[PDB]
Design a protein around this ligand. Structure first.
Ligand code: SF4
Ligand SMILES: [As]
Ligand SMILES: [Cl-]
Ligand SMILES: [Cl-]
Length: 419
């Protein structure tokens, strides 16, 4: 049986069947914006809570927003970038945590990494993706909070992507030592979900507004605050930037790199906060000979007559896989110098995933991107560490980002040659 069929069979069971599981769903933003096209409408023509009402009518017991998972991914990856930068600046880098750092949320990049780039594995962030962080959390924290055994929970994710099931199927996303209980059971694409609605005569555009559940299991709404982060990569940088400098990082505008297809970049200058440790490390020369395919050049430093020291963080974004291979070749010969790199396999990112509806409009992905966030939300910047649901989760259950419990729950590893 397909994963859609397995998921619909769990859903079809009466609440009073003894074998009825608790079934949880999580929804990616790129789904929410494109699912209206499944009914022949424009992107964004159905609201996020119309979609939550539709899912609730298929029989899900919770409906969750993958942006909660993204907030966990920001916490982890932001601290992870800052931690590697700090070890580099003190000239005591750990060998398993070199710069540059690459992101890890795209499974298409991960497969290519493991198959064709095994020497780069140590450079890749150890963070799980947003969907996996959220799955790991509901099967541990929330299960325990509700007195529900993890074996009696099923978790589905609606994704814009045909590769996210292969991410969920990596072996160690297993709950408590058996491969048989998976943190994330089933992935359904946008078009599969649109097709399930149509077969049952459910027209999203005409449903009433429903509601999201909070993965914490108390309090109303989705457990994410109003506003936008600019996405995981940007919010991770903002995390590190704002601790390092004491000053806000605005919304980033990436520019095209010339001579390379599908690659955008930015250079972010950073003066450490006065009185801070980061100011010390920059004051106290030998930050010359070292191993690895990507050898870090020691950073793009800058100076002032009076001692203002700074560093400039060199950021690149690559779409998709053929263009990423060319960046890597150039990083390896010393022609492109980057400290933090994001690789996505799709030319337009997740809004253009292979699980999305097909359109004759050459600009469909830019319309999906424009409608991802409600016009009022775009003007409010938000920060994951200020989310009271995230803070409660860390203060009562995980400890510190990068710490032991967070590592066990929210971090992963990569295998040379793939899986
Ligand atoms: S971006 Fe395209 S490829 Fe990378 S994950 Fe989202 S969908 Fe899959
Ligand atoms: As280390
Ligand atoms: Cl993966
Ligand atoms: Cl994800």
């Amino acid at each position: 049986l397909s994963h859609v069929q397995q998921a619909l069979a769990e859903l079809a069971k009466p609440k009073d069947d003894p074998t009825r599981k608790h079934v949880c769903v999580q929804v990616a933003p790129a789904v929410r914006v494109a699912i209206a096209e499944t009914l022949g409408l424009a992107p964004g023509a159905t609201t996020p809570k119309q979609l939550a009402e539709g899912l609730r009518r298929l029989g899900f017991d919770e409906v969750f927003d993958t942006l909660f998972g993204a907030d966990l991914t920001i916490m982890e990856e932001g601290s992870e970038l800052l931690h590697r930068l700090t070890e580099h600046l003190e000239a005591h880098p750990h060998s398993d945590e070199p710069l540059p750092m690459f992101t890890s949320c795209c499974p298409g990049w991960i497969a290519m990494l493991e198959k064709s780039y095994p020497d780069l594995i140590p450079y890749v962030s150890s963070c799980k993706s947003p969907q996996m962080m959220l799955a790991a959390m509901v099967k541990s924290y929330l299960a325990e909070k509700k007195g529900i055994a993890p074996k009696d929970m099923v978790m589905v994710s609606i994704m814009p992507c045909t590769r996210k099931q292969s991410e969920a199927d990596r072996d160690w996303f297993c709950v408590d030592a058996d491969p048989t209980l998976r943190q994330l059971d089933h992935v359904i694409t946008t078009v599969e979900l649109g097709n399930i609605f149509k077969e049952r005569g459910i027209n999203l555009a005409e449903l009433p507004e429903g509601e999201w559940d909070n993965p914490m299991g108390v309090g109303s709404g989705a457990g994410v605050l109003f506003g936008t982060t600019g996405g995981v990569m940007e919010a991770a940088l903002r995390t590190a930037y704002e601790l390092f400098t004491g000053t806000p990082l605005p919304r980033l505008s990436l520019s095209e790199v010339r001579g390379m297809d599908g690659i955008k970049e930015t250079n972010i200058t950073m003066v450490p906060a006065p009185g801070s440790k980061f100011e010390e490390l920059l004051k106290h020369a030998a930050a010359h000979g070292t191993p690895g395919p990507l050898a870090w050049d020691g950073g793009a430093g800058f100076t002032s007559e009076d001692g203002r020291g700074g560093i400039t963080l060199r950021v690149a974004v690559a779409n998709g896989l053929g263009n990423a291979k060319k960046l890597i070749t150039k990083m390896q010969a010393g022609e492109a110098k980057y400290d933090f790199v994001e690789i996505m396999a799709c030319p337009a990112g997740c809004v253009g995933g292979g699980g999305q509806p097909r359109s004759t409009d050459k600009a469909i992905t830019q319309k999906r991107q424009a409608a991802l966030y409600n016009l009022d939300e775009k003007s409010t910047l938000r920060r994951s560490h200020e989310n009271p649901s995230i803070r409660e989760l860390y203060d009562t259950y995980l400890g510190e980002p990068l710490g032991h419990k967070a590592h066990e729950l929210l971090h992963t590893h990569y295998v040379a040659g793939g899986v």
